[PDB]
């Protein structure tokens, strides 16, 4: 399957958390192609900044053979 590798910085808005939060604040993750639109919308609504997007897996322009 095609996959994106995305970097995002998601701040905290309505609370001052006391545990360590760096892991869920600035992170890089693999997102399946079929989840990126939804996932990108969710991060945007949570105030997150999408800092980097890459097509980690797959090729641009494929018509057949997406797995």
């Amino acid at each position: 399957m095609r996959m994106f590798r995305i970097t995002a910085c998601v701040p905290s808005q309505t609370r001052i958390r006391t545990q360590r939060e760096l892991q869920n604040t600035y992170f890089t993750k693999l997102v399946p192609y079929d989840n990126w639109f939804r996932e990108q919308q969710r991060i945007m609504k949570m105030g997150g900044k999408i800092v980097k997007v890459e097509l980690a897996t797959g090729r641009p322009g494929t018509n057949a053979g997406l797995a």
Binding site: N63, A64, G65, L66, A67
Partner: protein, 160 residues
Amino acid sequence: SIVTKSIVNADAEARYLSPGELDRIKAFVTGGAARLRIAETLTGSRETIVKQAGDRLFQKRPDIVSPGGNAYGEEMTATCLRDMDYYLRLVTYGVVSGDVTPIEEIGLVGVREMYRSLGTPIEAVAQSVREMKEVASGLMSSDDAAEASAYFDFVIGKMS
């Protein structure tokens, strides 16, 4: 193809192909010649198949090529026939690959959305493929028709 589908099913379980996944790959590859024949018969008479299919569709749905219909007018009938040739081309892809994945990836994923935007009645597009299956079924032996029909019918079912 049938090979990619088998591999995906096996990789989902982090395991090697089971006996059945291997049997069907072996059976499919040995049958490659018959599939390539059907693909060739469909490709050869594609012009005949679509135009004969279009005329039968219009006798079934005269509204679509009458004022107000989506395919009304020469250029629109030509586009409608153009689409029938698309879905014939994808049916040949399905036959040779032994898998309906190429058909879905190219011409059935989001088709309902695309034809909604364009205003085409998709059930009439299903009927068009029902006509091409009939016309194509007459150009081949009964067994070449039974395998070809399976991929036509998958298109018919996905477009309802």
